[model samples]
Target chain A: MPTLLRVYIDGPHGMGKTTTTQLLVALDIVYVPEPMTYWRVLGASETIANIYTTQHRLDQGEISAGDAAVVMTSAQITMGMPYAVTDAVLAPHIGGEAGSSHAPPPALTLIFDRHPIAALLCYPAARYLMGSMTPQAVLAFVALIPPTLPGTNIVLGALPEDRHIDRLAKRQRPGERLDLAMLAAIRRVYGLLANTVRYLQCGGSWREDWGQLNAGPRPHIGDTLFTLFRAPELLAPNGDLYNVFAWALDVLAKRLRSMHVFILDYDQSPAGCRDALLQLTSGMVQTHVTTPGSIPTICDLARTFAREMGEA
Target chain B: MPTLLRVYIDGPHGMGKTTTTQLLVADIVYVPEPMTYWRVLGASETIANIYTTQHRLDQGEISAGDAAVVMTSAQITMGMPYAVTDAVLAPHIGGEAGSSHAPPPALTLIFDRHPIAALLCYPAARYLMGSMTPQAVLAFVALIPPTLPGTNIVLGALPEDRHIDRLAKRQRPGERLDLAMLAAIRRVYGLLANTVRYLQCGGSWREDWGQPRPHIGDTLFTLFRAPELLAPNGDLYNVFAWALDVLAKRLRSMHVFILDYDQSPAGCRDALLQLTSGMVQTHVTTPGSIPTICDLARTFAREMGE
Candidate 1:
């Protein structure tokens, strides 16, 4: 049996993550759609926003983690699983080793549409902006995400605002209404959260961690995992993500090994996605902005995937 | 006759001052070419090296006695470009002569290639760079200029290095040395000449002339003129042009006015001057020249006061 490489595509709403995942599925890679669909199974009335809000309140200590798990599992049941997944169930499925009996076949490359952390951060952002969560509360919410996830291979489909808005207008579901401000806020909050994880991976002292990261001479991609964590501090001392992110980051640094974290600009749509998928398994997770308008065919995408898996 | 307005054109090398002055001549304005010709009559062996070597001695590269003739001649020769200019007309600008008998008709103007004070400041710069006698250099600079009162409209043709190299190749003399070094020195000499005069006219003290300049508001072209005069201290214990160029601006206290002057050769000289002076004042000897000059004159006057 071939041991499969698990890759997860993640980012804010409207960033072509869904479309990119479908194209990968068309290329015959095993695809696990985002956990949103599963949340619907608990009740026809259940929506991602419902599960997201519930999860965030639990994160803020308004609800216990035990009760939060029960609600999330019922939400997860709609994802087509026979049973619900808890932090324990979720953590085991992280690495190549599968915890669930229904894990993707070993030796096959399976790509998940949204990583848990990407969706997990968005609800807190949504709540924080809606006035339900304070800035400090948002950071506290982000800190609760299990740092024990097995996979560090992050494929982030980051598109520019105009491009994301264009995609949203074209493919957004009936109920989703996206204004520019909402999209901008999502990007800002997500970046801060990512930086938190980055800070943690670098030993998580605000004063000395940045210094140590900057201490080494300028870094090139793939030279060290430390380079993956270098993001300029965008949030202020009292800004939304400031306090809680560092503590969570310190927790993540220990869990994350030499992870491959690839972030690409997705304005080229599928061609960009295809390129990102091809580089997914490359040991170093590099951050690259793709030039728009490179229209790649589905055949080109599949060919690259086949080559990557040695199944061409 | 209208009181003949006398405005001389002056600025650093290759700033369109020559060409701009030539155009003013067609407007029936009395214009004199630069002193490059007058310097030739003082001695023989007209080589750029003579002025350059004298300039070098004045700069303290060689001792005072080594090349005094070449130095002073180059210094004196700078005031004389050619014999083509009338002695009375040109020497009047050197503070040597002026008379009501030979003056232009009222409202007409006389333009010189370089203003008197601009020529006066070169030896000071030459000495300052050479680090020779600081006190003597200061005293000599103040004594040299005749201080003839006149308004100088300096047309600065400031181009970057590439443009300068391009102009040098085209306009350089057969005996002239044309390299970045000489061109840089020409730039330095021209700037210091312009700034020292700016100081003298502003009533600033000579002992602290160079010091008061940078303290002034950001006078884009003029503030940067004497980069050699540039110092770290922006404000002295007391302010001079530093306070005036900026604060006294609304007081209409400008002793100097600078404008961009890059009109092509075909643009009428009188028109250019009218645009420059913000006045339509022109007495054209040529018939067709008068109308265009007048049109620009009305345009400028309306823009300035209206």
Candidate 2:
């Protein structure tokens, strides 16, 4: 098999994975539009509420399946089974395939809003609070789930929940029944899940139910340390799967590091996305999620790598 | 007669409404704590998930009541309404005694993280998605709300659903069932029933089926918009009612000339909150939710006589 750099951006819903991937594609690195973006656009009316942001990419004509692409999937849409996904999100990819022998993208980047690695890491229902998740009396979260994909990663960003709420305080949406506490739970839950998942994936046995106060068992260390605020986005600032995957691609960008990366910033590119670029000049950093400035620093580092390689 | 402010901070279970409230009390403005915090703490251990972050205010020895005031009526414990809720979360003058009531603090703020507010905000069996409100949910939210508690109010800081799950995700407590979503829903249901009973003076509305998708004409407008990353923290972020009410109290603090008329820095205060606050601050920004800002801004402008 060829040394393919298959990068997957996987997390919860609406975290901007597609926006980031398109950023890389716009920059000419191999870009694959998340299968769901185009499919959903084709299916629904273009509204700020329903499509959120990210719907503009379809307008830009950037969602083609090629050598490298960004693949989008919700943790639930797949029912936690990475392979068995058959939602409307799948139609675009299946039709584009040429032959029985047509290979999946040389690399598959799964875009998620919540971090899969962290979901597998945190305690069950770590995203909720008190007895309710929202004023609508709905479940904001239920359980932490690990990533099912073999080659997967994360990206992290941070902003205090209150500050985020203040931004929206002046710009409240209509008929939407969400609030800050719910937002806080989302960040907290993702971080908890990411940390626990990292430990478990790396063979560290630490069972934790963060909702309750319990000690980790002997040898099977109790889950300690609640999820901290990272940069000003979602998930842990740096320990996010997208950031980790981005790190890997930066490495590949250098020394033929053999990988790809994607991001989703909402404003600059499509309606909702950020910039994702391949790291071509140097090796990606191998920092853990606990690093204080990992998220911002990693992005800075990746930018430097791109610069050193003649494209800042 | 007197100007009032009401704030409502509600959302999913366990999102740290109490924890955030503590942060606000410690770092932000000093608002009088709501009575529910004390009441809930008294029985924290007895409750299944033990989500009594508010009660800690009592554990820390903060109270205005003469007695260690346990709830007088069952409605009080059940989150029943019309129970004379702490004189609107702000201290009232006992002028009949004449020359009583201590001087107002630098800021007379009220923090009401009422259980009724929590239950009132949540809908049964639905998730906190953008388009999930049923008519029963809307009707349930409409009655006896708009928490007019204090001079300046800060409404939200409700817990998220994920937090409840966190409690039961690991070792199941011997007494309570694990942190199942249904259990939390039931607890909130109790709170709603309690509130309805008191509001109607224990009326028939309490006995009627608390059906989903309410029948009342839609009067109340709910404007919410947090980024997807922060969507899960909906409860904590949803507390915009708190900030609005607080500003409502200090009407002078709002609607200043951007260049001059500088008093306390409402712009900076709001900026600081969004910068360091929780998940709702960063995520949960929907375009449709902007109307609340415009309306609240106008209301504050009118209050301040701007």
Candidate 3:
């Protein structure tokens, strides 16, 4: 069976992931862009704009967290629908992880603009930091995430905080405003996300360590996402993490453990960033295609997904 | 620690479960499924209704949405008895037992099946058989009452061939001979067992998912590849996938025990009784709550049990 490479370029919104990834669409390599149209119109009307204003209202003290949570939860469902649907659709064609030793470009490569984590995890987590979304609501979204299929190579962008803020201010999506709070929130969530992947890779158990006091030394607590959930809000009056929220953490850990994470330095120019991303593909895992035509089939599926769920 | 054992006897039907469970009773409150409300009281012949819908679902006479709607209503009807019982017992329940030396719990409730049988498992099994949408399954999951401490669920085990023979020998009036449904229910129970273990092991289900996948033919992942749940590209629809993710999230915390139904009912009863030593037990808020719980269980059985 022939194999194919699938790469997802993701991070906090600002770092030119859209531009850097635009350079890699070859005849065999399909570029699946973010689902803007779906967010803007199809999934729900002006979801990106609506999301921004809801956060704006919450920040301005014009709305309650309860009010913001309702909208944020609904918007996240909209934001993630296409991503969730596409992954669910594409997952079956992926046979298994291909051998990693000598790299031969077997059949096809598809680069995705972002994975579902943006809406389902990262953004919701960012909203939770901003006090616009509840941690409970965030876990609900986390539990909705489709199972991680084989060969998930996610590329997260890394840059200095100020540089990232400047990059965010430069290009904004429709209805987006210059909100440093959201920017910081997104950045921290992505940072925590990378650490979480590392934490799991090194055999960390969120439940064993932080969740309950019953296990080994609580290694890597502050460095991982478990520390983030330790805020007093999620804890019961009895001092333990609430069972419901802690179970969500378990679900969160289960979904993220198998993913292969790569960090791309976004401090460089777009061309250089593209090269850096291209090189990172060497360490990424790939999968065997179900059929010979599966390349074109997946390519069109990617294109059609972007077309219907657009960048609007 | 207070000692109270709540053993839930559950599995595919025709496991001769009620017979085994019947022998083990007295101070223990045995709470059976609400077949009275389900059959005579609520919907007439709910067993047939379930079988008919599942049959229609199998034959493509109805969509999964249709089957799920009827399934949801029936499940709601089936859960009221258990729901009321929990409400009656919940306030009288104290903290969970911390260690082995604790005093005995006033009441021990032996449920025929926990709400998940109607809420998660049967619906999930129906989804596996192409009768219920994963969305429908997850909706019920969202409504599944929170997992309490001292919650011990016992699911049955028997080889498929033996189960088929047992199933064929005894059939409920409204139920049909559906080996596919049997297989689906059996698989869901196994996944239920694995899910509990996965959560306790503090490891990823991805690695142990259905035990290495080489030796196992039907992990949750493999079962998800069913054509009924797939999109045109043979991908799982996100709606269905989300439902499954929620299913995993919900079942991860339950304490599960397996009873071999291949033996005589007496043996099954004895084995189940033996399994209770390791089961989690908790304290009741009120000292006399056991007799209250017992009275409630007996009252329900007198009016509600067949």
Best by DockQ: 3
Tens-digit per-residue lDDT, A1-312, candidate 3: 789888888898888888888864531777888877656644446777878998999888998875676557556655675666567557657888894436676477888888988877898888888887766556556545656888888999899998988778788678889889888878878888888887787787776677443122323657666666777665667887644455457667777888988899999988888888878887788888777777777877777766555567
lDDT (tens digit, per residue) of candidate 1 on B1-306:
222234555544554555555555543444444323322222233346554565566567876533432343244334432111211122223221132234443444545543333233344444434422222222222222122333444444444564465456544343343344345445554554455444545533333435334322222223322322222454221111222222222112213445344445445344455444432222333434334334333332222111
| Backbone steric clashes in candidate 2, count | 151
Candidate 3 regions with alpha-carbon error over 4 angstroms: A211-219, A291-293, B1-306
**Model 2, range B1-306, lDDT digits (tens) per residue?**
121222223333333333444344441132222232223311222132222211332255433121111111111122321112321111231111111132212222223334334323333322222122222122223222222223121222213444444434423232233244445453543333333323334222213312233221110111212232112444312122222222122222111111111112343234324422121111112333233333322332222111
lDDT of 1 by residue, A1-312 (tens): 223345667667777776777766675355544433223321224455645566556756797643454344323222222111222222323334332224433334556555545433454455445443333323322332334444446666577777778877787543345555556766765654455444444544443434444223333222332232332232434432222233333333443323445666687858667767665555422121122111122224323323222211
- As for DockQ, the candidate ahead, 1 or 3, is 3
Question: Each model's DockQ?
Answer: 0.00, 0.01, 0.04
Q: Calculate each model's fnat, 2 decimals.
A: 0.00, 0.00, 0.01
Q: lDDT of each structure?
A: 0.40, 0.27, 0.70
- The interface RMSD value for candidate 1 stands at 43.0
Off by over 4 Å in 2: A3-18, A28-130, A133-147, A166-178, A201-203, A207-312, B1-306
Q: Give the per-residue lDDT of model 2 (tens digit) for A218-273.
A: 22223322222121222234434222122221221121111112222322333233
Worst 10 residues of 1 chain A by lDDT: A286-295
The TM-score ranking, best first, is: 3, 1, 2
